[PDB]
Design a binder for this molecule. Structure first.
Ligand SMILES: Oc1cccc(-c2cccc([C@]34CCOC[C@H]3C4)n2)c1
Length: 860
């Protein structure tokens, strides 16, 4: 129909790639992915359109609960009914549930409307005014993030009673429209020739080839003969490997590196030896190579799409049999693996085995004992699966069969264990499928917390149709907030050729599953397009005229009908719960830094004061490492809160949306330490001593009794950020990248560098901040040591979750961030968390680094 053609054009525009481009590849793997995932996502959409009204609230407006709630005090609340300007202000308890609040609003409505009411509180949900956020379910009001925030800020919760018929009307409005093992011969290939090779004519060309299973070599690497540098080198030679065809594991990858020698790296290319349908590849392959910025096994197994300029390697995969050869089916593997010798060992060896499995590099004899005792591992140490997988001989099909027999009856593992198993160190497809099965129990909150890392893991996948893609799509189609961030994490990397195909296909499938959300996301893309054009203008103008001039010109551009329409009434890409209603042009500006980022302000009558929100649009900087740093800080805040420690952190939004483009959430009523320390005259904060400036500023924002709370907020957040910057090795910290809220809360901005990047970043204590902590007194050991206590408690909590941080950072290596590209970068985190030590030893070490920081602070 004409509606299908329109939806196809809308998807093409949204994802940034024409769908016709998928068809043009004439790739059966692409075609099957598109068909199967379209069916899967359309089935999820059919299920969603018939959800009950409360299930539909769970889909569109998933609950935002405090970390303590997951798994007393008087409170004033303002409640109105939908489409009525009239509101009721009443007193409830923080311990009361939404149902009691709703029953109270209904009794009030019945008295005011003089009618014995027809409505039960069970037919309603409470919307947060002017936000895509609702309060519902059997949780006390203090457990909702919105109420918890209102309590901390002192503000009165403003809620709207929304009836079930109104929620159903939303559901309806948003509907989609109407045998290998016999082949003993060594594996070999013919290296035919190269095309479009660029190198120094004085040198020679060589092709290094290796067979890998993840990062691990399946045998020794082999090199071609050296042939003189030219545009079309010709080898026409056989490269034989030290591994039988029968012993190639299912996920074996053949990896190449073309280089020049008198070493000068030129290009690299990888390919899976078996296709997506489990068939062993035969015949000619033209491999369009990727430039080398020598073998790169973690590199993509798809060819470079720039076939016009890429160097190409032509190879021949020999016909090993007169008929096609497929990897054996699971039943054949299980039959082979079912047979073995069950380990019988001494009581002393059982103690030595327990010692190593509970301990991750091992010696050869330690690996032999783990393998020998693999049945004992399964039955009594199931969480040591990763250790057993690492000792398995992936180059011996009998050993692999025996490992897979145990894997297929392995008990499900905790979420923490499964995150480790997604690492590229575990490349087998059954292992990958096992990890996904153990991750199905992830709550939507945990999935959201690790979504960024799960998206990065897609870059290690060998095939398009995989369990991780299906998992992410199914969870995204069942939770609109997950769907929102899955979309943006994929869309923001469409300018990266190695992932544009895979990411483009996932975004298309998602859109098939929610036509309405596709349109919501298109409205966000239109605002982003306008912001880029506006920012390009500001960049040009800022070099030619004065700031008030560029600001008025920026304002005139925004007041154009096309800009006013595109920039208004959208869901925020930083947070789909936040609605960006009317752009407040008068309040919009830009910042003086290099990229001239735009500062965009919004207001919303319906949301009142909560509708006053800002976004910063920045183009020219890669925001991926900032987002990762902020998400790690937010995880620290969750882990602390789960132990009842609230360090008053400010986990503001940061989201890459495109090529060196993204948004940052504005924290209103905040200023940089630098601006406050300028100590300007005729201000409430003006000081006799520069050290008095920050405290005088806090006193001016918090007069009388409020000062004590502000100093406390400052102290707790200082402790949180001191521990966060030390653990993450956040460097380049000065007064212009540290901010303070009027509440007293300190937070960090502009996370350009982390993990010591290479130098070990020491713990930092600044004397201007010690002065505030000590309430302006020269000596105040009571307050200072209380602050040290918060630091120690925060640090010991993080250490206890050390493995989670390590597993997440390990998955992030797939992102290709320059400061997270090797083992040295992660060693930084291993050292800061001192995980190879006892808690008493690590606390002793932290105390040494803290005291060293105090003595450095005392020099000021
Ligand atoms: O994470 C980054 C990365 C790069 C630049 C920055 C930045 C620079 C200047 C201002 C800000 C604020 C101002 C107050 O609200 C909080 C954040 C948005 N952030 C933050």
């Amino acid at each position: 129909d004409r509606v299908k053609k329109l939806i196809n054009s809308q998807i093409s525009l949204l994802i940034g790639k024409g769908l016709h481009e998928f068809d043009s590849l004439r790739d059966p793997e692409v075609n099957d992915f598109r068909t199967k995932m379209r069916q899967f996502c359309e089935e999820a959409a059919a299920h969603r359109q018939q959800l009950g009204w409360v299930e539909w609230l769970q889909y569109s407006f998933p609950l935002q609960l405090e970390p303590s709630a997951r798994g007393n005090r008087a409170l004033l609340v303002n409640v109105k009914f939908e489409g009525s300007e009239e509101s009721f202000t009443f007193q409830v308890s923080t311990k009361d549930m939404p149902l009691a609040l709703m029953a109270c609003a209904l009794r009030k409505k019945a008295t005011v409307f003089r009618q014995p009411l027809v409505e039960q509180p069970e037919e309603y949900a409470l919307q947060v005014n002017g936000r895509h956020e609702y309060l519902y379910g059997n949780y006390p009001l203090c457990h909702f993030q919105y109420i918890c925030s209102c309590l901390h800020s002192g503000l009165t919760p403003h809620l709207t009673m929304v009836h079930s018929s109104s929620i159903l009307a939303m559901r309806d409005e948003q509907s989609n429209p109407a045998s290998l093992w016999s082949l003993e011969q060594p594996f070999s290939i013919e290296l035919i020739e190269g095309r479009k090779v660029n190198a120094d004519e004085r040198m020679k060309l060589v092709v290094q080839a290796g067979l890998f299973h993840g990062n691990e070599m399946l045998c020794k690497t082999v090199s071609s003969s050296e042939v003189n540098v030219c545009s079309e080198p010709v080898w026409k030679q056989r490269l034989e490997f030290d591994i039988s065809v029968c012993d190639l594991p299912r996920m074996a990858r053949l990896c190449f590196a073309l280089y020049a020698v008198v070493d000068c790296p030129i290009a690299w290319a990888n390919l899976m030896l078996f296709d997506y349908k489990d068939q062993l590849k035969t015949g000619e392959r033209c491999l369009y190579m990727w430039p080398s910025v020598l073998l790169n096994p973690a590199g993509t197994v798809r060819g470079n799409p720039n076939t016009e300029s890429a160097a190409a390697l032509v190879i021949y995969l020999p016909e090993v049999a007169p008929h096609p050869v497929y990897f054996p089916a699971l039943e054949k593997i299980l039959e082979l693996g079912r047979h073995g010798e069950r380990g019988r060992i001494t009581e002393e060896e059982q103690l030595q085995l327990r010692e190593i499995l509970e301990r991750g590099e091992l010696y050869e004899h330690e690996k032999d004992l783990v393998w020998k005792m693999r049945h004992e591992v399964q039955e009594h140490f199931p969480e040591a699966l990763a250790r057993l997988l690492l000792v398995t001989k992936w180059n011996k099909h009998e050993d692999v069969a025996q490992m897979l027999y145990l894997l297929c009856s392995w008990p499900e593992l905790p979420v923490l264990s499964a995150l480790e198993l997604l690492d590229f160190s575990f490349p087998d497809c059954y292992v990958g499928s096992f990890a996904i099965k153990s991750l199905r129990k992830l709550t939507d909150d945990e999935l959201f917390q690790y979504l960024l890392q799960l998206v990065q893991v897609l870059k290690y996948e060998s095939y398009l149709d995989c369990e991780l893609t299906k998992f992410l799509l199914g969870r995204a189609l069942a939770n609109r907030k997950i769907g929102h961030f899955l979309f943006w994490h994929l869309r923001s990397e469409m300018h990266v050729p190695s992932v544009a195909l895979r990411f483009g296909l996932i975004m298309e499938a998602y859109c098939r599953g929610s036509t309405h959300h596709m349109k919501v996301l298109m409205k966000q893309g239109e605002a982003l397009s306008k912001l880029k054009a506006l920012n390009d203008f500001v960049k040009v103008s800022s070099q030619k005229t004065t700031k008030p001039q560029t600001k008025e010109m920026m304002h005139m551009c925004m007041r154009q009908e096309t800009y006013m329409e595109a920039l208004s009434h959208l869901q925020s890409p930083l947070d789909p719960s936040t609605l960006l209603e009317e752009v407040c042009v008068e309040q919009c500006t830009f910042m003086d830094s290099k990229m001239k980022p735009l500062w965009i302000m919004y207001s919303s009558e319906e949301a009142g004061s909560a509708g006053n929100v800002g976004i910063i649009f920045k183009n020219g900087d890669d925001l991926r490492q900032d987002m990762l740093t902020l998400q790690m800080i937010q995880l620290m805040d969750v882990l602390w809160k789960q132990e009842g420690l609230d360090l008053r952190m400010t986990p503001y939004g940061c989201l890459p949306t495109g090529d060196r483009t993204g948004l940052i959430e504005v924290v209103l009523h905040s200023d940089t330490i630098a601006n406050i320390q300028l100590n300007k005259s005729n201000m409430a904060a003006t000081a006799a001593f520069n050290k008095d400036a920050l405290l005088n500023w806090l006193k001016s924002k918090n007069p009388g009794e409020a000062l004590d709370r502000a100093i406390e907020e400052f102290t707790l957040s200082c402790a949180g950020y001191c521990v966060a910057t030390y653990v993450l090795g956040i460097g380049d910290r000065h007064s212009d990248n540290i901010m303070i809220r009027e509440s007293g809360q300190l937070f960090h901005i502009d996370f350009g560098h982390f993990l010591g990047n290479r130098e070990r970043v020491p713990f930092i204590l600044t004397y201007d901040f010690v002065h505030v902590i000590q309430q302006g007194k020269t000596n105040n050991s009571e307050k200072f040591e209380r602050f040290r206590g918060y630091c120690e408690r925060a640090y010991t909590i993080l250490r206890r979750h050390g493995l989670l941080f390590l597993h997440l950072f390990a998955l992030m290596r797939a992102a290709g961030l320059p400061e997270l590209s090797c083992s040295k970068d992660i060693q930084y985190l291993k050292d800061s968390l001192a995980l190879g030590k006892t808690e008493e030893e690590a606390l002793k070490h932290f105390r040494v680094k803290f005291n060293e920081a105090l003595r450095e602070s005392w020099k000021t």
